[PDB]
Design an enzyme around this catalytic site. Sequence first.
Site, short mmCIF file in Angstrom:
data_model
loop_
_atom_site.label_atom_id
_atom_site.label_comp_id
_atom_site.label_asym_id
_atom_site.label_seq_id
_atom_site.Cartn_x
_atom_site.Cartn_y
_atom_site.Cartn_z
N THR A 1 27.62 17.64 -17.76
CA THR A 1 26.66 17.83 -16.71
C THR A 1 25.35 17.04 -16.85
OG1 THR A 1 27.60 19.98 -16.11
CG2 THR A 1 25.29 19.55 -15.46
N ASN B 1 25.65 16.65 -24.42
CA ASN B 1 25.07 17.99 -24.23
C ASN B 1 24.33 18.46 -25.48
OD1 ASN B 1 25.83 18.38 -21.56
ND2 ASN B 1 27.56 19.74 -22.07
N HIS C 1 31.10 15.93 -12.34
CA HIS C 1 32.35 15.68 -13.15
C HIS C 1 33.39 16.69 -12.69
CE1 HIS C 1 31.37 19.38 -15.11
NE2 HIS C 1 30.16 18.89 -15.35
N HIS D 1 35.68 19.72 -19.86
CA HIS D 1 35.49 18.36 -19.34
C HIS D 1 34.63 17.63 -20.38
CE1 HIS D 1 31.40 19.60 -18.34
NE2 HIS D 1 31.97 20.77 -18.03
N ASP E 1 28.95 -10.12 -28.10
CA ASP E 1 28.02 -9.01 -27.98
C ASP E 1 27.92 -8.29 -29.35
OD1 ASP E 1 26.20 -7.31 -26.83
OD2 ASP E 1 27.71 -5.93 -25.96
N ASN F 1 25.35 -7.15 -30.87
CA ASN F 1 24.40 -6.02 -30.89
C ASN F 1 24.77 -4.89 -29.91
OD1 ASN F 1 23.67 -7.34 -28.55
ND2 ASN F 1 21.47 -7.36 -28.95
N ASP G 1 24.90 -4.28 -26.77
CA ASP G 1 23.99 -3.83 -25.70
C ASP G 1 24.57 -4.11 -24.32
OD1 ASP G 1 23.55 -6.70 -25.54
OD2 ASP G 1 21.41 -6.55 -25.71
N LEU H 1 25.15 -6.98 -23.08
CA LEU H 1 24.53 -8.18 -22.52
C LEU H 1 24.84 -9.40 -23.43
CD1 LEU H 1 20.92 -6.72 -21.95
CD2 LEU H 1 22.80 -6.85 -20.27
N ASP I 1 24.96 -12.32 -25.82
CA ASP I 1 24.14 -12.69 -26.99
C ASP I 1 23.59 -14.12 -26.85
OD1 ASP I 1 24.91 -10.29 -28.16
OD2 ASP I 1 26.16 -11.27 -29.72
#
Length: 806
Positions: free
Chosen positions: A159, A180, A309, A420, A683, A685, A687, A689, A691
């Site tokens: 949630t 959670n 969910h 879930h 990639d 690291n 992230d 994105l 490198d």
Amino acid sequence: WTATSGSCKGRCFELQEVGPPDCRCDNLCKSYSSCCHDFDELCLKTARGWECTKDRCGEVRNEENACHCSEDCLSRGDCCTNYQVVCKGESHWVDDDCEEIKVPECPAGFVRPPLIIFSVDGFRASYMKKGSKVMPNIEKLRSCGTHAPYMRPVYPTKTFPNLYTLATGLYPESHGIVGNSMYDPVFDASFHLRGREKFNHRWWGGQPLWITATKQGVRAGTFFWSVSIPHERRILTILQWLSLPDNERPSVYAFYSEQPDFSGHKYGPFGPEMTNPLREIDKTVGQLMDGLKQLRLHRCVNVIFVGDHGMEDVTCDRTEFLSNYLTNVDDITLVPGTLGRIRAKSINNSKYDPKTIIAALTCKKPDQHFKPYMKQHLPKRLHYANNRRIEDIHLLVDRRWHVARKPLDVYKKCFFQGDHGFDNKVNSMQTVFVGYGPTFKYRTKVPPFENIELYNVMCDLLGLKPAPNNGTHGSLNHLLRTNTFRPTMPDEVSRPNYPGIMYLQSEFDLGCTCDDKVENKLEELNKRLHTKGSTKERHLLYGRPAVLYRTSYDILYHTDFESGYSEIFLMPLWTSYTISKQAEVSSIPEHLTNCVRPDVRVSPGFSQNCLAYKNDKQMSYGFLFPPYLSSSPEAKYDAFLVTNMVPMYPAFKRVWAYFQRVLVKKYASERNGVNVISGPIFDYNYDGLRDTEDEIKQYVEGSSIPVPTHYYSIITSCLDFTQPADKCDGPLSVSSFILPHRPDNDESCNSSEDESKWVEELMKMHTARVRDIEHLTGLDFYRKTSRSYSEILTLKTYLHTYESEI
Ligand SMILES: *[C@@H]1O[C@H](CO)[C@@H](O[C@@H]2O[C@H](CO)[C@@H](O[C@@H]3O[C@H](CO[C@H]4O[C@H](CO)[C@@H](O)[C@H](O[C@H]5O[C@H](CO)[C@@H](O)[C@H](O)[C@@H]5O[C@H]5O[C@H](CO)[C@@H](O)[C@H](O)[C@@H]5O)[C@@H]4O)[C@@H](O)[C@H](O[C@H]4O[C@H](CO)[C@@H](O)[C@H](O)[C@@H]4O[C@H]4O[C@H](CO)[C@@H](O)[C@H](O)[C@@H]4O)[C@@H]3O)[C@H](O)[C@H]2NC(C)=O)[C@H](O)[C@H]1NC(C)=O
Ligand SMILES: NS(=O)(=O)c1ccc(C(=O)N2C[C@H]3CN(C(=O)OCc4ccc(OC(F)(F)F)cc4)C[C@@H]3C2)cn1
Ligand SMILES: [Ca+2]
Ligand SMILES: [Cl-]
Ligand code: NA
Ligand code: NA
Ligand SMILES: [Zn+2]
């Protein structure tokens, strides 16, 4: 400390929060134990219940009543929601035929259509069909408005991660609500469902919709509701706020229901006990829409009906216990349940070792119901790694199962039948979306989409500029009648070089060899034409990818494929080729087994060398355009150019060779030709994105050849498969993957068997969106099609999930 001595008189459900120790009257004061002494008396009236009756009509206003049926109630904004039905002969909203809302029909002084987000916890996508008989209000919203067959949540499918993703447009790794239960090692602080730490602001990153609105001059209702405020009172509060003077009235509101999730955990997603919670939620929707109709707002407000969910069948007996695998179980801390996260119990124990824990949990039991991963090896589509609150060791748990540390945690901490949290591609975790109102379309079905896209749309609905987020703004324009967002393609940053023949064979000292000296004005002109780009229209179908960062690269043309070759990374950033339905698979000829050929367009200085691969005992190489799919024996030589070569571990080559030899042709047969664009991803690291060159952690031994962390492919064909991929007049169809470039196949427990028994399963797990590949490569694809740019943005966000029907 709270001075609970002040009063809530004329302050009930105030919107601006007052600071401690002054007592509060807002919809969350209960959560903080800080409400004024008379909050319940004044703010939570229950007398005479929630419905007008014939005998209450035209009554003398009794201010003690929960809601009103007096003549004055409409102007006061506090009638019971069924007032006009019972007292003034009106119809319930659900009984009215639907009628297209072509323009907002709003009262004077409304500056914009308000937005109401109606969120339902645990509302599995299949409830819309399976419970439709007992949910007439929701069914009216869905059939009359704009709906998807399902909406994909974020992982983990819990949630708070999902409601905060809906609020921010961000992946959990970016907004910081990764579970959670969380431990943040920087703050040395723990987040739990129960208790007080979760209210601390340092957990909640990004910019949620209510802050975006407030910063831009748009007033927001308070999103969060204390659990003890009954749903009827939440609805009457929203309706009262909507009756405020123009200068005080919010434009955006949220309702939240803890059902059907609450009952789902106890009874399972389809327990017979689930019909009642669905009926009650439908009745709440009816109260809202009847209340809007009374206020003349039912053809003015945009309503979103959205879940966080779904819910799966999970019982105590389906738990795996780490104490059955680990000898050292008391030296670890496990975050348990429908996912697992492991760290050292004590940062002082020098004997803790992640590698030995991973190995002890890998393929140990034949029907093992979880799989361990270092987080950087999790499927990239989960975007579940770049946050210090995500432990390095993760367990992906099979649907219907739990993991726990020891048996005593489960019978000393069966009750439950539903849960879930699983991988967000699992069908039982999918949830719902319906949009209804003047800004949404009428009786329109849209394809499934991810919940990270909705922040942008909610900003569009309210005329707000979104904060930077992970949606792709414009990809959901097909949901909207108006207020669409029309972006421009990003500008290309680096333009390519187009090198011709510049180097003699003898300038290359690469340690490579090839039996290719087996050597005509007809055919010689023809091969020069291919090197000049004469077949490029066949293999580059959607234009060349744009490079969105500064680099030096060359376009290389060939008979069977085109590539964008990086002089910095010494390999292609992308390689593009089309395989028709009728294409023939061939072998790598014996005399070419170990052939690698210098490319006389590209300097020896900007080339790989074979000597580095000979010397690196762990590393081999593969090819991006596959030799198996050459159009002729002569064209096949082009596939062995050093500029088509990429570094590959032997274990990974088993995967890659099967994809290339068997699966590409299978897809071409099934889809009526495919266009494939393949390439490396770096990639290190994790992230999500691309490198830069200075982030690369591993090279081919002795060389400057960087080792990809992943290899991708984007496989595109015509949506109408009666048309071949290279002559498609309309919409496109795509599927893509991002395969991890790993030196073993430990991830695949059946990898000792023939690749036909495990490779495609691996590839399905690592399915990806084109947009995921864009982030990871800094490339922008599909620049030259005959399609609307918004249509193309939707295509780039598509994920092929391989799940059977919802
Ligand atoms: C999904 O969408 C999101 C949003 O667009 C994308 O996330 C952005 O990505 C950018 C690149 O990673 C990132 O840019 C960095 O911003 C730094 C400033 O950060 C603060 O301010 C912003 C703006 O208000 C704020 O949003 C940030 O909030 C984060 O941090 C706190 C916790 O610290 C959290 O509460 C919050 O949840 C959020 O955390 C997330 O992001 C951070 C990274 O910022 C992660 O570490 C967390 O795990 C979590 O994921 C911040 O409060 C800025 O400092 C960075 O600049 C450095 O690096 C650049 C590289 O270009 C360089 O030019 C600069 O010089 C600078 O270098 C110096 O620092 C280096 C590191 O210390 C050091 O090595 C050097 O030597 C230098 O000294 C950088 O620009 C941006 O903040 C986030 N935004 C968000 C909201 O997450 C995300 O990429 C998208 N995902 C995908 C897959 O596409
Ligand atoms: N099902 S679970 O993961 O086990 C679980 C976790 C937490 C809990 C649990 O106690 N909560 C207390 C509830 C009170 N909340 C609330 O009022 O939310 C309002 C809200 C917020 C954002 C929204 O999205 C938007 F911004 F609009 F995009 C929409 C609505 C949600 C909380 C969950 C319950 N179950
Ligand atoms: Ca990176
Ligand atoms: Cl969790
Ligand atoms: Na080698
Ligand atoms: Na294996
Ligand atoms: Zn739940």
